[PDB]
């Protein structure tokens, strides 16, 4: 805990002048795609475990709200995510949706 005036970091800030010689800063946005893959992969996994912990229709109905919230994550950055990743995050929820319907058919009554 030195509590001093760290102004030396501003001398190194001049290194940004080197980035100006490369392509446009619009490509720096491509580093945020990794965040989406992280948060999405972590979220999909939690929903995939909730439906397994469920014992009755009550917990099953709760898992249907978790999957509906995960589609909203892509809806925020939809125009940012490529056709590859957009289609991936959308269809990925459908993959886990089957794991719920496979338990639902044995939980809820049949015709």
Swiss-Prot record:
It is found in: Cytoplasm. The modification Phosphoserine is found at residue 56. Expressed in the retina. Expressed in the rod and cone photoreceptors, extending from the inner segments (IS), through the outer nuclear layer (ONL) and into the synapses in the outer plexiform layer (OPL). Strongly expressed to the photoreceptor connecting cilium at the tips of the IS (at protein level). It comes from the Eukaryota. Belongs to the TBCC family. Supercomplex made of cofactors A to E. Cofactors A and D function by capturing and stabilizing tubulin in a quasi-native conformation. Cofactor E binds to the cofactor D-tubulin complex; interaction with cofactor C then causes the release of tubulin polypeptides that are committed to the native state. Tubulin-folding protein; involved in the final step of the tubulin folding pathway. This is Tubulin-specific chaperone C.
